Amino acid sequence: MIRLYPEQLRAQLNEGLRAAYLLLGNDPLLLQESQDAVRQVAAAQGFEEHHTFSIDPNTDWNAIFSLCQAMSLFASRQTLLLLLPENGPNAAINEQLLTLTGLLHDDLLLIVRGNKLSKAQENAAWFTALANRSVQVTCQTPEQAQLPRWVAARAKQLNLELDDAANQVLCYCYEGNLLALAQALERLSLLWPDGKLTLPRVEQAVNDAAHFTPFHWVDALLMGKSKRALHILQQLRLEGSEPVILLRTLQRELLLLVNLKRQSAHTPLRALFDKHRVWQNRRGMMGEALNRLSQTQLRQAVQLLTRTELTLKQDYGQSVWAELEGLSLLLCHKPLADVFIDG
Amino acid sequence: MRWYPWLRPDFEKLVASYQAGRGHHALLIQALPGMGDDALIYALSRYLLCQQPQGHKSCGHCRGCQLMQAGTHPDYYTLAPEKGKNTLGVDAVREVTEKLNEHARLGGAKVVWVTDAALLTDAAANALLKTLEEPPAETWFFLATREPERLLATLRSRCRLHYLAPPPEQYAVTWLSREVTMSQDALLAALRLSAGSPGAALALFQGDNWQARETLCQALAYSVPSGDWYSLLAALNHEQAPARLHWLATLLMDALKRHHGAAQVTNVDVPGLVAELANHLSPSRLQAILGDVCHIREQLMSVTGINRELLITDLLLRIEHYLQPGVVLPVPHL
Amino acid sequence: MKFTVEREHLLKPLQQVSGPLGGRPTLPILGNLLLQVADGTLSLTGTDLEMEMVARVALVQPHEPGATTVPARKFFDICRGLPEGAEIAVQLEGERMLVRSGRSRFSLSTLPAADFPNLDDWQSEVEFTLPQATMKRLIEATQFSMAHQDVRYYLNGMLFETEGEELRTVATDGHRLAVCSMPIGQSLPSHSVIVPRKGVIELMRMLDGGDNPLRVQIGSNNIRAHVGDFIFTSKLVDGRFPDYRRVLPKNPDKHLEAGCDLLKQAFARAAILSNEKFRGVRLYVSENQLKITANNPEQEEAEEILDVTYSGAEMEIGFNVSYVLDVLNALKCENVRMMLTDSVSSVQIEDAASQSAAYVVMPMRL
Amino acid sequence: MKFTVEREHLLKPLQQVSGPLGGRPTLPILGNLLLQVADGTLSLTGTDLEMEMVARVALVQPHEPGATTVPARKFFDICRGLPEGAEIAVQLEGERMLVRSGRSRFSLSTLPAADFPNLDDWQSEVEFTLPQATMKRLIEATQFSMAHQDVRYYLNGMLFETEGEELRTVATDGHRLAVCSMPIGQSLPSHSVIVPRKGVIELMRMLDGGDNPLRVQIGSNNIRAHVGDFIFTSKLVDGRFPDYRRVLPKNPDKHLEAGCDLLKQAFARAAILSNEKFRGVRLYVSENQLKITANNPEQEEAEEILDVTYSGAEMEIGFNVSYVLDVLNALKCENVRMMLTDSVSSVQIEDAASQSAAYVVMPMRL
Amino acid sequence: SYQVLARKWRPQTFADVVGQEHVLTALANGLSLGRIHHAYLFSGTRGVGKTSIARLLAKGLNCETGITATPCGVCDNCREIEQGRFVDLIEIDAASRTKVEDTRDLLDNVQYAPARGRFKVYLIDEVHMLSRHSFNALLKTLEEPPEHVKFLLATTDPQKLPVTILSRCLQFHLKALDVEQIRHQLEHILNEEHIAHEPRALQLLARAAEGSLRDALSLTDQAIASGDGQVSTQAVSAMLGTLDDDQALSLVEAMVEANGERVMALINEAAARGIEWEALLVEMLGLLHRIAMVQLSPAALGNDMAAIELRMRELARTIPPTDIQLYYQTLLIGRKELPYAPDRRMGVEMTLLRALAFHP
Amino acid sequence: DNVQYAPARGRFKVYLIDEVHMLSRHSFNALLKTLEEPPEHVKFLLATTDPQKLPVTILSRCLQFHLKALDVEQIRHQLEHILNEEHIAHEPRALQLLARAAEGSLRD
């Protein structure tokens, strides 16, 4: 029942392997390296079989049952990996997992990879049964604040030397794409064996390959950093993400902000936050957004959003991204006369 | 569907044409909601499909009448949108036209009923144009629409237009009073609100729409003095948003007419709210707000899948902006 | 009122009526089967709003007149569940029919028979009788030229034309015409009607080429045919089928005779290298010579030469090889006569042995 | 280039070469067969890159040497569509091929033979003749155990190892290994190569129980088989087949000899009475007793008792019914001997009379 | 069998068609000279003779007596075309045949020679409904078709078609029929139908036709059905909801003189009498235009309004031209938005109140 | 698939694709490989009214030639020449009106 992290998982494996393993999170590089380390430790221990299966209703289970109830002809103590679906286990998958836990054997080394389960999905019969001998490695992608420390530690483990400028450049270029960040670190190490990576060194051999989500864009707009908002909008545009989801995500927070600002005239903020049941970590962010802009704003923003939606699903043009970045700049502490944007 | 008394004359007229064999193949009924145009179309189809009609009414016992009662007549190919949708596709028109393309099984006449030509798709209407121009022998069409202007020019040209005018105001008032036990003022307000078309007012009374209107009126009464129009969203955000916008538009129009001087108002049931709204707002502000409300209602009705709450709150914010002194008020212009 | 039925005799009419019926009739009662009893016979009827198929079978046990409706799916399931060769007992008791399967009793929903879309009275305009062989031959000769889906609604069926002692079937799709006429032995009024695709297909799949003649009666709007114990009625279209005399070539001067087997083999061999989509071929006809040529978009040339009898000049005619092959397959004779005027005119195909049938093919213009 | 043949002689080899070649080709020329006439022989290769089927036919007419590639499908259609017994004369004019048959002519587009994927001049590492019977026996003995679909690509096929005057085939799918050896009679260098599933399937398809000595040539990455005047070349699947020597138990002291037919019928009865999937059957063997029970915790235990000739220690093993049934089917005889060491070991099955073929399976842990 | 006037009186010769002299002359001259194109696109408003002219051209091309400017209408092919039976005249609906297979078979069967006639006419209706891929595929056929097929294209609005289609087609702009032409055609039809008619009724029906003759015939049939088989002025006025009285002028005077109570009372009583609101707006627009005209030139006023002359003249002396233009603009704005208003009464009241807001 | 085969009689197997911009993105990508390295006896002649829809790769793989709308004077001169060749009476004002009506498309 031990919750651990991939950074310190090597020591946990070295002190002794565990019957059950499961990697939960969203970071691809951390999950991949944890899986590789576990598999290598198992192989050193003497496990030669590395069976992998993907959980899906279309996929069968007779082969899985036969392999879990049977050894290997020219090996022993197999290892089985299960790739959970992105949405998460359903009732049938829950039945399958508890069945697997029922006949689980010590010689089999269980590994599970997939998106981190939710609170409702956290509790389950198979999960409780495995809790007696379950070590779960959290594999979430570090936040922007946690990114510089993570990349600095990664570089130090690689015997490289990074300054503040190089760390900032790497964070900017590979925000949320830590796999590409590590690949870039390896490439830079190969290019310059000396190990000293100054700002020209990193900047001349890097590319903008960051990946984001619309929630990150809304957070950037709330903070008010124009450069980050424009960068994330560019990344989402290049990724091909449709603007409808961005518009909806922006609209939700815009309506929340408008309601809070209008009803905060004679009502304490704490009572409103408690009633709305918003995230505790977002209380200060919402306060900063509210006090950063007055009622003069949050009015042309809504009209601009409505105009954007109309021009999107009525004219069916391609200038939606221009309107989105205009609204992004508007939400920041900018003049934005709105004559250009037709707010 | 129900057969309202005021359908007696018009029906008796239309059937007379079919009594002489000179009836128009394509008939377009211009009737407001609640006027029972569906009942009129059903009665006309029953008369047409009756094997041995007597006078105007059908016999009620011939094979055609029995099939109509059972609702399985091989003829009488009706067109209507899918229950889970709100528009009629071209495929339905295609298959109905193909079925009409051959002789009637009973050897009598074939009837086609389009429940609402307004919901008909442009492609569907254009496909229907050919069969409507030169229908096969003994083929009759019965279209229906609230606003024939919304239909295509060609389709309106093909059809013979019959306008089902509503009854006299007093007749509708007394009919509703006999039907629903409520104050005559509320009945008159509903009738004027429903464009003086009984049945639609009756439908409004039957549902919870009356309580919604009362809540909206109370919210507007609270908002007008304080100026906090945003709270109105609470009483406006609903699946029936266009109806609530129409109610608000009628209230604003009544206030404006009271300002200009008038003896009758649509919202007679709330003199106090109309008086307060007229007193607390200038005629230019009332006109601007009414135009904005009507435009947003039209956008909500015409546009499909538009974010309702977003448009409503944008309208509320713009209305609040207009009330601020020194702000230029937009004026309608084609 | 007791209904005693034998499973072995019950099987056949039920399958025939359930054939056209689908999984979702789209109406609550359309898929239901109307069972009626009159005098000493019972009729099982099924309709799909555009056809009515009724099987009439006699009985020996006493009964009383009546009519009722039974769901097709539940009835078929009950029949399947019962052991083969057993007896079926059905009783009309109240609003729900009662079926006795051995010691078990089951209740089945019933619906009024007055709601079934079936004709109560029938009027016939022209009626006659013919052996099934005549109709089978006529349809086999004419149907393959029937159009499947064309904007010209009148061209997607078969024209039945009864003139005096002669009965004729005509079909076309704008590119090929097939006509088959022959005497029937009795005089009839000059009447022409059009039977749609579904009617002809159902008639063919229902016809068995038996020795018992069938009676056909055509009314103002519908056509009904009774063969043995089955009666199928469909509704016509009356799209004013084009006159077939005009489409035929007017005095085709150039006549050439050929062997049906040789010609069909040559066309089949040419078709392999012809355009798989356009399927066009060229025929250079000269004195006792027929050169068939075919090309492909890849420029694959296929040429062959056939010896025939022909006294005309030299000409080049384009054709659709598929239509010619279909005509030859539907011909089934030892000799084939082709009549034509010029390269830009329709070409007629007949048999020297008997002219009871003829075909016309529209050439290719590039 | 020019030659003349009869469609009777070409119908079979064209079908053979064009059989495996199906679907769209990876390269356009791979969709075309390469035919070459030289020294009185016409060889047609239906290359599939991975596999090459070559059919050779004899030429007696005054041909002319030459090679060219032509699409297989249309050429085969042309050859098949001609009249039976007709002779086909093929010539090359320009970049096209002309086909003449009596009064019929065809033209086909031909790609240059240079662009055809050339069969490299790799010299066979081990070439040797062999009768068909031994090869067929080896394939039958070592084809039921190879994995049909496994992540380990090298286990999809089976491994042929030639050592001295001996050829051995080993197949496995992760649980059982079947190994069959046959003395070739001629000393050869040691060499191991994995043949893929499709290659062996095509090879066994080629086998027809003839008297032609089947010549096998094992190369660095290609295996070729000559049967009479037909050649089948396949690309050996890479990887490294696990050594079978370690898999074979050293001293399986415990022995069990029993009638093969008795075990076959017992397993068939268990399978038919235990059609439910999963839940491998558990067999308890004791002195003159064998009780097979269904592991199904829900389905009733269809226990079956047989009187085997075993008189050793008693134990219960949870085997898979399908696995043992297939293994016993592969060994079709009257008696069978199974040797095991303990509860956890690989039981080796063999014929009580012959021991050339071994069937080392392992129990399914319970 | 009884047929409506639109079907009964469909032109059967180039002389029976009313108006559109230029296109008819061009078609006749082309047929006479033998200079015939392979693509005739007809553009114009509804009810102007698209299908009629297309069918007449098809008859002229397919007549058995050679290519004739005026088809006889009695041949086998001529009669079949008149009855919609001619196989070589394929009438295609663009909206229905939008799928890929439809156009693919449309351009695949062109090679086949005509079954009966000398030209395989393709009459495609409302061509603007075809998909872009359909136009792209049909460009080749529309450019260099075989010399046995003619494409006849009909569309309400030609601009929506791809520019290439317009380039490859001869465009004939069917002018909207004027009031005089519609009145003359209706008079001729009623005289030939042995139906009595009044000049006022014919004028009103022609005015309400809005330039389309099919709409005029439909209105005439509606009046016949309602008018007990008599085209009477009173019956047509009741059917069409035409004021033809001083109510419109009184309401305009009230609107100009503010006095909202009078305007509201007038609208209330008009609604009680059940009139057509679009007719009321049109009448107001006509009155305002007449007031402007008399302000510019007093001689431009007729005698029909003599009973209301002086009062009307008073407006011409009292209202400055700019205010007249403002009122006309407001009335036109109301006209545009009347269909889209929640109710016709609400739209009219909003328009009149907006006009009332304006004042010197 | 049939591009590799040699031309029937012509020295090149010229391809002329009309309105190439209508091809799907996948079709363009599949065509890229043959466009870069076509057989020596194969020539591609793409054509489209809207060149901005084409992928940048397609544009870079081929020589572009953007035909310009013909001048009004050029259209008038061409009309005069063809009418003179056909022996048809014409007036300068009529030719000017026709040239004005035809914006830049000589076909119009």
Ligand SMILES: Nc1ncnc2c1ncn2[C@@H]1O[C@H](COP(=O)(O)OP(=O)(O)OP(O)(O)=S)[C@@H](O)[C@H]1O
């Ligand atoms: N120019 C015209 N001359 C004579 N009759 C006409 C004319 N235009 C319309 N009509 C009459 O109106 C009927 C139908 O109108 P059409 O001739 O189809 O005009 P249309 O433009 O084709 O209508 P659309 O565009 O399909 S709605 C005809 O049968 C005539 O009776």
Ligand SMILES: [Mg+2]
């Ligand atoms: Mg028309």
Ligand SMILES: [Zn+2]
């Ligand atoms: Zn009746």
Ligand SMILES: [Zn+2]
């Ligand atoms: Zn004629």
